[PDB]
Design a binder for this molecule. Structure first.
Ligand SMILES: CP(=O)(O)N[C@@H](CC(=O)O)C(=O)O
Ligand SMILES: CP(=O)(O)N[C@@H](CC(=O)O)C(=O)O
Ligand SMILES: [Zn+2]
Ligand SMILES: [Zn+2]
Lengths: 301, 301
């Protein structure tokens, strides 16, 4: 049974859709309340939000792990590390039964990804059923599921605190910009997610369901010159073609001289986060993913 | 006769198309050289480029005036001030005959403005002729001219150093990103600008011409709180509709609730820089322009 729900906004301070909503919701939350459901809206990175930048000392959505949450409180720590602890204490602790049940973390991307749900665990049948529900509600408005569970990769998100972590990504949108159509898409996504929880809490039964997801394989950097500067850019056939298949023959990058660097490798892939501003400093031009199906067992409260 | 020509990129450090070309052209100018014409590429704000921020201490493209350029040099002064003077000493002095003849200043905008030329002087026959040549040469691809001449508004641009300052602005592109299609557009604009200069220098006579331009009337802020926080955002109809006519009854802003706030007044207007990331701090949702026609007298070298 689902009791404790939060919506985080402003994990990244220059992703204004979430910030705008949460800050309105703090003043009037009617939209995010249901019957017998209390959800708490919350500004994750208030300082980065004030400076309208992604972060102050380091990326908040990467540090919710033992290395960082186990450090001694201290004014000498990076701001985000201090803030990660404050959040763990408020909405976790992480890996405890006292933690929040569900956390929705709201994000924006410059990539042409549309409505996107981040899945941190392939086995969780509750999430697969939620995601199936939202996907289907939204349609024919498309909505895709990025699955980030992986051995060496995968990062400790802000929402990993909860038993049920949910990432909500909407793009394309420039950083520092509030576009109405994106705002609307993110509201519709939440509308359905919260509806599903309520529906489940009034003991509805959901049959088995399948969904298609995109599983991370590896991350590709920009081809780089002899000093570490970018020597080629996202080829225009690849620009804005997130989710769509890319075959070994196909064009990845383009040089100033007009030279085209093709995919190579062995098989088809589905690129994600194509040309995301914030990933330039992470050496990620885009991420390679395989398409695969996940099956959920029926569930009931 | 035109001798000294510069191309500035990186005036704003997170506008990467200019920075990316200029760094390449610094390593191989072939593309921007014309026979009998030497063109110097230059990075105006190398420091803001390092951090991929718009600026360090203040906006570089607003301070090339007497107040700042006449100041005594010291380390208490904002970086950009100290930097502006250093640029005046290399490509000016501004208002002197020893200054460069033409400076092209390269920019990107989040607004959906397409290929855009900034005209600083409505009576400058030479520029008007150049712009008409570029417009004509780019067709059917559109090209738009924004006349920032105004008694009160109008600011001291990096490029105002030259006898003939030219601003090149290409959108939409998110800050901190390199799109190929936007890059290609800026290169073509430059190709044709240099071609024009060369042709003129080889004595070709240019008959009189007319161009449509858009003259700044006034800037419009987002409607705000009692706290000064944004209370409404760019309406979906207005979004991405730069240059297109906006009538008095038409939707302008949108609340979460969401009520539409219409234009008001009684004259039609032409909106420019709709939803520009960098202008949120400047408190400009968009600029209202009136669209008029300018003539050039014929010219010859
Ligand atoms: C480009 P973003 O910061 O909105 N994407 C998230 C992805 C996620 O939510 O896991 C991140 O990089 O932290
Ligand atoms: C969107 P931008 O900052 O590159 N445009 C210039 C306008 C210009 O080039 O005059 C500015 O705001 O100073
Ligand atoms: Zn984010
Ligand atoms: Zn600029």
């Amino acid at each position: 049974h689902i009791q404790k729900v939060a919506i985080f906004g402003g994990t990244h301070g220059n992703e204004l859709t979430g910030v705008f909503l949460v800050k309105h919701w703090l003043e009037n939350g009617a939209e995010i309340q249901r019957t017998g459901l209390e959800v708490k809206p919350f500004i994750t990175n208030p300082r980065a939000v004030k400076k309208c930048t992604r972060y102050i000392d380091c990326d908040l959505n990467r540090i919710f792990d033992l290395e960082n949450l186990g450090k001694k409180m201290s004014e000498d720590l990076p701001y985000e590390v201090r803030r990660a602890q404050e959040i763990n204490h408020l909405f976790g602790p992480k890996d405890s039964e006292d933690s929040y049940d569900i956390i929705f973390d709201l994000h924006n991307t410059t990539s042409n990804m549309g409505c996107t749900l981040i899945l941190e665990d392939s086995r969780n049948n509750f999430l697969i059923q939620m995601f199936h529900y939202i996907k289907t509600s939204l349609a024919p408005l498309p909505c895709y599921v990025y699955l980030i569970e992986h051995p060496s990769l995968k990062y400790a998100t802000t929402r990993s605190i909860a038993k049920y972590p949910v990432g909500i990504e909407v793009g394309p949108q420039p950083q520092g910009v509030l576009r109405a159509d994106i705002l609307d898409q993110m509201r519709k996504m939440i509308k359905h997610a919260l509806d599903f929880i309520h529906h489940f809490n009034e003991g509805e039964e959901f049959p088995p369901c399948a969904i298609e997801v995109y599983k991370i394989i590896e991350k590709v950097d920009y081809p780089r010159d002899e000093n570490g500067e970018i020597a080629a850019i996202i080829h225009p056939n690849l620009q804005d073609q997130d989710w769509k298949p890319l075959h070994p023959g196909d064009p990845m990058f383009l040089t100033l001289d007009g030279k085209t660097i093709p995919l190579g490798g062995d098989c088809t892939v589905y690129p994600v986060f194509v040309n995301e501003a914030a990933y330039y400093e992470k050496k990620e031009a885009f991420a390679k993913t395989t398409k695969l199906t996940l099956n959920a067992k029926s569930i009931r409260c």
